[PDB]
Design an enzyme around this catalytic site. Structure first.
Site, PDB file in Angstrom:
ATOM      1  CG  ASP A   1      33.093  46.993  49.354  1.00 54.68           C
ATOM      2  OD1 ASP A   1      33.453  48.191  49.377  1.00 54.68           O
ATOM      3  OD2 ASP A   1      33.750  46.102  48.784  1.00 54.68           O
TER       4      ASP A   1
ATOM      5  NE  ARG B   1      35.631  48.605  45.888  1.00 59.68           N
ATOM      6  CZ  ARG B   1      35.531  49.766  46.527  1.00 59.68           C
ATOM      7  NH1 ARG B   1      35.759  50.902  45.907  1.00 59.68           N
ATOM      8  NH2 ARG B   1      35.181  49.790  47.798  1.00 59.68           N
ATOM      9  CG  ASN B   2      31.614  46.090  45.056  1.00 62.31           C
ATOM     10  OD1 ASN B   2      32.179  45.212  44.397  1.00 62.31           O
ATOM     11  ND2 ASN B   2      32.058  46.497  46.234  1.00 62.31           N
TER      12      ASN B   2
ATOM     13  CG  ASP C   1      29.864  40.654  44.020  1.00 68.32           C
ATOM     14  OD1 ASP C   1      29.274  39.551  43.934  1.00 68.32           O
ATOM     15  OD2 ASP C   1      30.902  40.898  43.398  1.00 68.32           O
TER      16      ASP C   1
HETATM   17  C1  LIG Z   1      37.748  41.441  43.022  1.00 68.20           C
HETATM   18  N1  LIG Z   1      37.052  40.966  41.824  1.00 68.20           N
HETATM   19  C2  LIG Z   1      36.992  39.648  41.477  1.00 68.20           C
HETATM   20  O1  LIG Z   1      37.551  38.818  42.172  1.00 68.20           O
HETATM   21  C3  LIG Z   1      36.241  39.192  40.220  1.00 68.20           C
HETATM   22  C4  LIG Z   1      35.601  37.830  40.397  1.00 68.20           C
HETATM   23  C5  LIG Z   1      34.384  37.991  41.239  1.00 68.20           C
HETATM   24  C6  LIG Z   1      33.752  39.162  41.477  1.00 68.20           C
HETATM   25  N2  LIG Z   1      32.716  38.944  42.314  1.00 68.20           N
HETATM   26  C7  LIG Z   1      32.660  37.629  42.660  1.00 68.20           C
HETATM   27  C8  LIG Z   1      31.781  36.916  43.474  1.00 68.20           C
HETATM   28  C9  LIG Z   1      32.024  35.554  43.610  1.00 68.20           C
HETATM   29  C10 LIG Z   1      33.061  34.922  42.933  1.00 68.20           C
HETATM   30  C11 LIG Z   1      33.931  35.598  42.118  1.00 68.20           C
HETATM   31  C12 LIG Z   1      33.712  36.977  41.979  1.00 68.20           C
HETATM   32  C13 LIG Z   1      34.152  40.495  40.879  1.00 68.20           C
HETATM   33  N3  LIG Z   1      35.178  40.180  39.834  1.00 68.20           N
HETATM   34  C14 LIG Z   1      35.158  40.636  38.563  1.00 68.20           C
HETATM   35  O2  LIG Z   1      35.986  40.246  37.752  1.00 68.20           O
HETATM   36  C15 LIG Z   1      34.242  41.697  38.153  1.00 68.20           C
HETATM   37  O3  LIG Z   1      33.870  42.677  39.031  1.00 68.20           O
HETATM   38  C16 LIG Z   1      33.122  43.555  38.392  1.00 68.20           C
HETATM   39  C17 LIG Z   1      33.051  43.218  37.089  1.00 68.20           C
HETATM   40  C18 LIG Z   1      33.802  42.047  36.924  1.00 68.20           C
HETATM   41  C19 LIG Z   1      34.019  41.262  35.651  1.00 68.20           C
HETATM   42  N4  LIG Z   1      32.992  41.572  34.670  1.00 68.20           N
HETATM   43  C20 LIG Z   1      31.644  41.237  34.814  1.00 68.20           C
HETATM   44  C21 LIG Z   1      30.789  41.495  33.717  1.00 68.20           C
HETATM   45  C22 LIG Z   1      29.468  41.206  33.783  1.00 68.20           C
HETATM   46  C23 LIG Z   1      28.906  40.645  34.945  1.00 68.20           C
HETATM   47  N5  LIG Z   1      27.608  40.355  35.019  1.00 68.20           N
HETATM   48  C24 LIG Z   1      27.149  39.854  36.150  1.00 68.20           C
HETATM   49  C25 LIG Z   1      27.993  39.578  37.252  1.00 68.20           C
HETATM   50  N6  LIG Z   1      29.281  39.854  37.208  1.00 68.20           N
HETATM   51  C26 LIG Z   1      29.763  40.382  36.074  1.00 68.20           C
HETATM   52  C27 LIG Z   1      31.125  40.678  35.982  1.00 68.20           C
END
Ligand SMILES: CNC(=O)[C@H]1Cc2c([nH]c3ccccc23)CN1C(=O)c1occc1CNc1ccc2nccnc2c1
Length: 271
Positions: free
Chosen positions: A133, A137-138, A151
């Site tokens: 994916d 966005r990832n 991810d």
């Molecule tokens: C579809 N999206 C989501 O459900 C949420 C929660 C989530 C994601 N992936 C997961 C994997 C396992 C469990 C829960 C989740 C992705 N997601 C986000 O909000 C998100 O996506 C991109 C940016 C963000 C929020 N901002 C940051 C900022 C700094 C960061 N540094 C390091 C790592 N992640 C960061 C995220």
């Protein structure tokens, strides 16, 4: 310590400081590990993921380390929700970062973002690991503006059938080659295709690919052999690179090593 394997972090070592984001996968928080080290704490939404499968995969993923891949530090699996503990990326989502026009990016910076991702993907390809994916966005952006791939592989554990099947409403149709859309043929070359789309997103400052089309129309467009076209900020050479990712024949698409070589050549010629 006792009761935590090499892949297990003790959640009592976490200090939660700020919420970073919420979505269908759960919630990401910024925090500290053992009072000192910045981490992201990714809290898996109950019912969203195939948890035992994810945990088993996390053990393998612990061995993956590359400076352009978001570092997995461990998981917290003894309570629900499950936590994934990773490197913290202070500037957040690449897609949002690209869309903030204040940055007034030079094309050299855009190429460097592409290179960052390409390096991570070459690393994953060298380990025979697919992202599955890949998209802006990832990807995430750290405090120094370095882009890292985030991810990777996570889609394998997502239970929402709207996300996972080629005919689902949340499936990444616009990042998918014809062989994925037509008969679910995932490979290195579907990551390559997606990477080309990701270069397009970078050079387009975060436009939606095929922004005037629906997913259905996009699938038809790309099945007819038609493609995205050149972002205004992409030189001919940069466009040639992203376009090479979109060969109808998967075996004619480059590898990540080749893409990396091409990107470096363009940096030398143009940056
Ligand atoms: C579809 N999206 C989501 O459900 C949420 C929660 C989530 C994601 N992936 C997961 C994997 C396992 C469990 C829960 C989740 C992705 N997601 C986000 O909000 C998100 O996506 C991109 C940016 C963000 C929020 N901002 C940051 C900022 C700094 C960061 N540094 C390091 C790592 N992640 C960061 C995220």
């Amino acid at each position: 310590g006792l009761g935590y394997g090499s892949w297990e972090i003790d959640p009592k070592d976490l200090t939660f400081l700020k919420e970073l984001g919420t979505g269908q996968f759960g919630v990401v928080k910024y925090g500290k590990w053992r009072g000192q080290y910045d981490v992201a704490i990714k809290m898996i939404k109950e019912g969203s993921m195939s948890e035992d499968e994810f945990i088993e995969e996390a053990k393998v993923m612990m061995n993956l380390s590359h400076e352009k891949l978001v570092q997995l530090y461990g998981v917290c699996t003894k309570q629900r929700p499950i936590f994934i503990i990773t490197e913290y990326m202070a500037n957040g989502c690449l897609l949002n970062y690209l869309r903030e026009m204040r940055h007034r990016f030079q094309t050299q910076q855009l190429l460097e973002m592409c290179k960052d991702v390409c390096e991570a993907m070459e690393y994953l390809e060298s380990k025979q690991f697919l992202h599955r994916d890949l998209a802006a966005r990832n990807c995430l952006v750290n405090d120094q503006g370095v882009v890292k791939v985030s991810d990777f592989g996570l889609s394998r554990y997502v239970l929402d059938d709207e996300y996972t099947s080629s005919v689902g409403s949340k499936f990444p149709v616009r990042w998918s080659p014809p062989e994925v859309l037509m008969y679910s043929k995932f490979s290195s070359k579907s990551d390559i295709w997606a990477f080309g789309v990701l270069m397009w997103e970078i050079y387009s400052l975060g436009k939606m690919p095929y922004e005037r089309f629906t997913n259905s129309e996009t699938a038809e467009h790309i099945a007819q052999g038609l493609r995205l076209y050149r972002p205004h900020l992409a030189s001919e050479k940069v466009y040639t690179i992203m376009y090479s990712c979109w060969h109808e024949k998967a075996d004619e698409r480059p590898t990540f090593k080749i893409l990396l070589s091409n990107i470096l050549d363009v940096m030398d010629e143009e940056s």
